[PDB]
Subunit: 281 residues, 3 copies
Amino acid sequence: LKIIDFRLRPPAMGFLNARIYTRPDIRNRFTRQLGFEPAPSAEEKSLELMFEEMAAAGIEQGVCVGRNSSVLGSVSNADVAAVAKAYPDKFHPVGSIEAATRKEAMAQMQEILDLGIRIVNLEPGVWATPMHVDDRRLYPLYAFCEDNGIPVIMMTGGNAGPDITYTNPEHIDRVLGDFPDLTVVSSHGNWPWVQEIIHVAFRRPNLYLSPDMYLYNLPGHADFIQAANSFLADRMLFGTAYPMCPLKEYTEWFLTLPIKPDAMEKILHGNAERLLAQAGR
Amino acid sequence: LKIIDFRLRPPAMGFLNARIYTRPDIRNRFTRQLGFEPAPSAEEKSLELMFEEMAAAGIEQGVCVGRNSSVLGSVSNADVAAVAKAYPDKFHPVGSIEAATRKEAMAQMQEILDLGIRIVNLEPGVWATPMHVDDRRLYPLYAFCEDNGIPVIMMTGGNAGPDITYTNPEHIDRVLGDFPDLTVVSSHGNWPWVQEIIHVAFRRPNLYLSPDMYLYNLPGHADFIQAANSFLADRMLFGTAYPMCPLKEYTEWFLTLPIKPDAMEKILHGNAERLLAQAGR
Amino acid sequence: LKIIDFRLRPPAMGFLNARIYTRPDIRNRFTRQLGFEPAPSAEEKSLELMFEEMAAAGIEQGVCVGRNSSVLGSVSNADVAAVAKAYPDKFHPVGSIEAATRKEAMAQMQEILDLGIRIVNLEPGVWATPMHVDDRRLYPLYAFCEDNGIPVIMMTGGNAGPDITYTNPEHIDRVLGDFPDLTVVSSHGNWPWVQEIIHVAFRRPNLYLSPDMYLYNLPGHADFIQAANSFLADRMLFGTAYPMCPLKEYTEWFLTLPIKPDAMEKILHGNAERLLAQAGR
Ligand code: NA
């Protein structure tokens, strides 16, 4: 079985400057609170060990999700492009933006497009100026992304902002309503508001869900899996959130889940493949 | 066993001018997403075939829920009365209002009463002037309805408005709080906010839930069925949302759910009968 | 197995003036709707029968949560401290505040501390002027409590206020964010917003959950138990909400729950012992 991990941040270049690597202590406590042991590759910050674990898990490719955050640390978009070009068979680059203004957002989007990157990651709740995903100042960017076929990853689950209002499903739903042709991926799957996000997915055909780490032994698990076996088969994206979860143990667990095999193939690989090929029109 | 469908919109007269029939592409998309195949009678727009499917499903009566909506299309209240008087042993009429002002809401309620209809349907999130169910402008109407024993159906689940805020349980909860003797039916059962709406129903004894289409293989399913076997036995209403769901397959699926027979009788007909007899006091 | 009941209001001087005892009719209607029969000790208002019922269920100690409320009645803090001193082996006193002005709140907090009580209960949604738990006017009190190691019980589940907004998880989450060293216990466990509150508890290590009566055959049950068997073993507190639930039947049922033995020990008594010993640093 082929697997594309929709959230894999390798221990390479600028990724090591993000808090996921600069604060191994915080990360490891989070990993253990979830129910996993830290991945040896993550703890040793070894790309070599990561590649072994990746192959042993059955993961053929990883989506290298960029990050630019005052709160959570930063990897340069140039470094994300550099990691992907170094291993072009193994990695897909996703650029990120941290902006106070709409002009800063477009300058950075253009920087991303100049690197050949065609997907962007927005985590505005952990920016220097924290904002909701439906903040007015982000609307010109969504307009650009919608017009140019750029899919948008947005962190609308987990600790997406200062408090739980930053995950209320009203924020992602407004964006989807206002930009009906914009391809959106919700990283952390808008957890914990899971009954609600399944409705949003039901209503808004261009939303993909990626609960990633929060799929594991938490509220909403059964809701995600039920939807996976129905309409969400084409719109769920497998992801480990590595280094937050181990590649091996998360994937092995995932493959045992009662998701019907045709939906399993879509969720593990098929959907990501379609989205990644679609990116940039 | 007697079955009263609390949400059946027949392919007859002005019902055929509503988006549920004028846009079968939108309807069939939701139907297939739910996991059903479109009903032959819906696709054919045949009242004859609907009567066949209705009889085969074991459904003796349907509640013809009128609709007046800029977004979703409209059926005159006179058309609704006409359908019911044409088949008085098959159909119960429910009037609908679309208003910008409280006086327009009154004038339409009076028009409904003049037709001998004694239950009203409000879907204010899909009006030309969209509003929440707890909008100040609707309060005079709720006052009149409470004082005159008129049950109100209100769409507070599913795609009730422009975005998910139109299903936030705060809106229905305030209405129930401010009008504690007003009989209220939440059509689509305030889905997706199911953990929340069970609390609301627990607290507000005048609230009836009708999850209808959204009971099918979606989040909250087990919460609704748990409540149905306990305190909500007297306050849940069977409904298909036909033409959104086929009569046969929905009803056959409903009939095998784990609901004790005395709650099952109430939910299939007993609760609807009491409400229909109550209506107009 | 030793048990500490984190919500047990005895039929003793003062507590008898609250609506839990002055309206046995409303109370018994709730108890039966939940699915229990009223405790004989509650019905007969006998401290004598209560101790028998406690000992039979294995409840060694009860937390006599004081109440000061316009909506739900009041019991003076002196009366709470006097129940505890009459039975020092059986009862832990918890003070309560109802205040309009913060100088009223601070005089009441001082009174509590003078009475030897080291835990305060806040139910601001049921005060004469209802307010949310994150109301700016409560921040001085939280700051005092945080600096002086006073744990705060706050009712943020159930009928915590006039409507469901008074249990929206944004309110408790803000308090927890702005007072990260404050020990907070959510009485009624912030039910019905269970998927959400498990995230809040996951994020906010100072939060303890006591779902009490709402654990029983209601939405969120499986979420609470799953949390109890994972990260929340150290932060869940057994309680019956007596007289709302019978000591005998609630406790017997709770003991049959699939909670791993070391978590069962912590939740039944260990967590409370720790909290009660910590109280007042
Ligand atoms: Na919820």
